[PDB]
Amino acid sequence: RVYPVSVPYSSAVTLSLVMPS
Amino acid sequence: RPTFYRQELNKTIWEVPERYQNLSPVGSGAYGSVCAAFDTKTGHRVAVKKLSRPFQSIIHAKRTYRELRLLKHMKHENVIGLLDVFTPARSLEEFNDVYLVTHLMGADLNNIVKCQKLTDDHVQFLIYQILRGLKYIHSADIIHRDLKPSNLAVNEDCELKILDFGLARHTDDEMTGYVATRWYRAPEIMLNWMHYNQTVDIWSVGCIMAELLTGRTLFPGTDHIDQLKLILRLVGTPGAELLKKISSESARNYIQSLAQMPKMNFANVFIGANPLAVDLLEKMLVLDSDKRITAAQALAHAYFAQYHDPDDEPVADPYDQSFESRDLLIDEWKSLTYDEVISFVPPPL
Ligand SMILES: Nc1nccc(-c2c(-c3ccc(F)cc3)ncn2C2CCNCC2)n1
Known part of the structure; x- marks a missing residue:
């Protein structure tokens, strides 16, 4: 079975997460 | 000893030093529940975990000691460590409840x-x-x-x-x-x-x-x-x-x-x-x-x-797990835990 990644990788800078309420 | 205050929270009672204010539940942790708080002494947001019936069984009591010993030892940016550990008890004889404090995570x-x-x-x-x-x-x-x-x-x-x-x-x-x-x-x-x-x-x-x-x-x-x-x-x-x-x-x-x-x-x-x-x-x-x-x-x-x-x-520094091989009563795990609560030194402010 295949499990594709949520966000395909792209070839190329600060990270954030939306917090649950 | 700090002045403590009392308050009920998700149908359990919490007794904490007055520095910790605005307690707000954010769920359950390993053998307990957790509130967010604000620590008026340092200006930090903290998570306070009250252990659940920490000494109501040998398994629980030994797990309490384990957990307190671990958290005292862990000093790393990517591992939860201890800002504070306290109890409202003035002596071993009235020791029943253990609270652990760390930096609030979102x-x-x-x-x-x-x-x-x-x-x-x-x-x-x-x-x-x-x-x-x-x-x-x-x-x-x-x-x-x-x-x-x-x-x-x-x-x-x-x-x-x-x-x-x-x-x-x-x-x-x-x-x-x-x-x-x-x-x-x-x-x-x-x-x-x-x-x-x-x-x-x-x-x-x-x-x-x-x-x-x-x-x-x-x-x-x-x-x-x-x-x-x-x-x-x-x-x-x-x-x-x-x-x-x-x-x-x-x-x-x-x-x-x-x-x-x-x-x-x-x-x-x-x-x-x-x-x-x-x-x-x-x-x-x-x-x-x-x-x-x-x-x-x-x-x-x-x-x-x-x-x-x-x-x-x-x-990490050496960590002594020799207590793991020991077979003790609830009251001996309790006294060991009390020792660790009393010997706690808070990390560099
Ligand atoms: N929000 C937040 N921030 C830091 C830790 C926790 C925490 C604790 C905990 C541990 C030690 C301590 F000293 C104080 C708190 N135990 C479980 N959890 C979270 C684990 C994920 N679910 C919500 C509670 N929660």
Whole structure:
């Protein structure tokens, strides 16, 4: 079975997460 | 002694130093519940955990001591450590309740994967921070044993800390979160194949990484056999060596009962993934515990090239686990725990 990644990788800078309420 | 105050919270009573204000529940932790608070002495947001009936059984009391000793020892950016530990009791004789304090974290990875898609850059940094904490824990001869997304605390800026490490001890023991724990458990512990070691934790990181990339549980087994079916479906059936390394002749007879499944090529499974991420997964999810990459080796893997720093990936100080072999009464575990609460020195302000 295949499990594709949520966000395909792209070839190329600060990270954030939306917090649950 | 500080002045304490009292307040009821999710139908239990909380008695805390007045420095801790605005207590607000944010759920349950290992054997207890947690409130957010604001610490008017330092200006920090803290999480305060009240242990649940810490001395109402030998198992509970020994687990209380274990947990307090661990949390006092852990001093690492990616492992939960202790800002404060207190009790409203003025002496051993009235000692009943234990509260632990750490820096407030905003969420856990379980709730994170449940409400957003993660990019490869998030996955890189999140997994890096897990392996970095794990290199530390493992250097002190501690095994987490229950690594799962809900045990990984994160903030809005992707900072991560491991928690509930070293608290499990037997697969014969009743615990909360059992079904989720199993999804990330290395097969040899689940099914008691052999004496296991710390590589169990790397299997768990592989499961978590696969999940952060795809947003879906990699092996959502319903019971022990189903869980095993799902695992072998991906990694294949155990080759030559591994069957020669299963003392558990019960598992062994069951296993060779199963018709051969081949090993899938992960590149063909995880479509759209960074090949570096795929290649790390290949190294973590190997059935043969002896062949899995270690935390320390994994940090040097090119997937983390952007974050890796050999001079800022520290090991831990020696940690004495000699109490683990001891067979004591509730009151002796209580007194040991009281000692540790009294000897606590808060970290550098
Ligand atoms: N929000 C937040 N921040 C840091 C830790 C926790 C925490 C504690 C905990 C541990 C030690 C301590 F000293 C104080 C708190 N135990 C479980 N959890 C979270 C685990 C994920 N679910 C919510 C509770 N929660």
